[PDB]
């Protein structure tokens, strides 16, 4: 049920170990040009 709930919701992953290198080559890319960073959860 968690699988179905997370699949059916329109959520994009902010890359926490590769994202800088994914945008390098949306809002997730906008983070590094604007000057804000979305922190990982606990």
């Amino acid at each position: 049920l968690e699988d179905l709930l997370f699949d059916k919701v329109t959520l994009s992953d902010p890359g926490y170990m590769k994202g800088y290198d994914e945008c390098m080559k949306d809002l997730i890319c906008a983070q590094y040009v604007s000057g804000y960073k979305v922190l990982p959860p606990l």
Partner: protein, 48 residues
């Protein structure tokens, strides 16, 4: 702005990149005549 900082995982500044090369294009622009301002009679304010 202090020195008796507490522990914690702080967020530091964004270190911005630095210029590595210089790329230039101009399409080989010609020159335009601005001596037409000093070619004929001086225009009248009514007929500028």
């Amino acid at each position: 702005g202090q020195f008796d900082m507490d522990s914690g995982v702080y967020s530091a500044s964004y270190f911005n990149a630095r210029s590595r090369g210089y790329y230039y294009e101009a399409a080989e622009l010609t020159e335009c005549d601005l001596d037409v301002l000093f070619k004929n009679d001086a225009p009248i304010i009514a007929n500028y």
